[PDB]
Design a protein around this ligand. Structure first.
Ligand SMILES: Nc1ncnc2c1ncn2[C@@H]1O[C@@H]2COP(=O)(O)O[C@H]2[C@H]1O
Length: 197
DNA sequence: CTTTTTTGCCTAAAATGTGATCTAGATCACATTTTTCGCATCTTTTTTATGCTATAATGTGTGCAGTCTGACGCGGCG
């Protein structure tokens, strides 16, 4: 596709785990785009505690909020989770490509709109539902993510307990307490990895 | 005999589990200021019921029918 063309003019960089791509406050001039790898986007306080806004999978764009307003600062940290294959594109050259071909936006707008779908749902559940429904509707959809293994009447996920406190942004010990109370609910069959029946 | 692949160890190391102990949150039945609403005033404002005008003026038709007609009633009509 366009991928290999653009790869000829190689901006594609390969980053290992945890090399910091984005600090916030940086200058916004370069779009990236993903070939391969997984990455977490996150934010923290002046006094240190950090928050994972989300994570992102292959095929998606980075940093898109900057192109519109010339000279913005980068909004959040985006810290490599694993080995990443990463495009890099200038806002100038990106606008050029916009004047060349906008059908790319046909695909792009869709994932953006469902980002709204999920972010509204984020703030909504933050308001309406306690930790119960919080991690309930976490694992219910964790049962649906590819890398999910089948459990005959159920589903298996082995993401054991560290990524979870990040994908929801919570303590793991409290996740413990209530995993065991959901085990008490006959909801979850879990021993590290969990069997969403 | 050499390679690589595996496991277990070294060696460094994150994630799990103690529950005891508060602490900001949210409830919760009942008094007060605001909306601007509804009917009585004004209060105009328009509109409406009523009232005069002193040279002089004296019997319609008014626009039509085109007239159906056969039988029977009924008042005449002798
Ligand atoms: N709620 C979100 N969902 C998905 N991606 C996000 C979200 N918030 C921020 N990002 C991405 O993280 C990037 C951080 O810097 P930018 O604002 O330049 O562009 C941002 C988006 O690409």
């Amino acid at each position: 596709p366009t991928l290999e063309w653009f790869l000829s003019h190689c901006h594609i960089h390969k980053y290992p785990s945890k090399s910091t791509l984005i600090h916030q406050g940086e200058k916004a001039e370069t779009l990236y785009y993903i070939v391969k790898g997984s990455v977490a986007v996150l934010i923290k306080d002046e006094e240190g505690k950090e928050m994972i806004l989300s994570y992102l999978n292959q095929g998606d764009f980075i940093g898109e909020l900057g192109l519109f307003e010339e000279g913005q600062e980068r909004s959040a940290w985006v810290r490599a989770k694993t080995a990443c294959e990463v495009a890099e594109i200038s806002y100038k050259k990106f606008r050029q490509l916009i004047q060349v071909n906008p059908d790319i936006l046909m695909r792009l707008s869709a994932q953006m709109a469902r980002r709204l779908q999920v972010t509204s749902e984020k703030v909504g559940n933050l308001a309406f539902l306690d930790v119960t429904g919080r991690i309930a509707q976490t694992l219910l959809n964790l049962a649906k993510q590819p890398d999910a293994m089948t459990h005959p009447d159920g589903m298996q996920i082995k993401i054991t307990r560290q990524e979870i406190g990040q994908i929801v942004g919570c303590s793991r010990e409290t996740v413990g307490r209530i995993l065991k109370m959901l085990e008490d609910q006959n909801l979850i069959s879990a021993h590290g990895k969990t069997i969403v029946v």
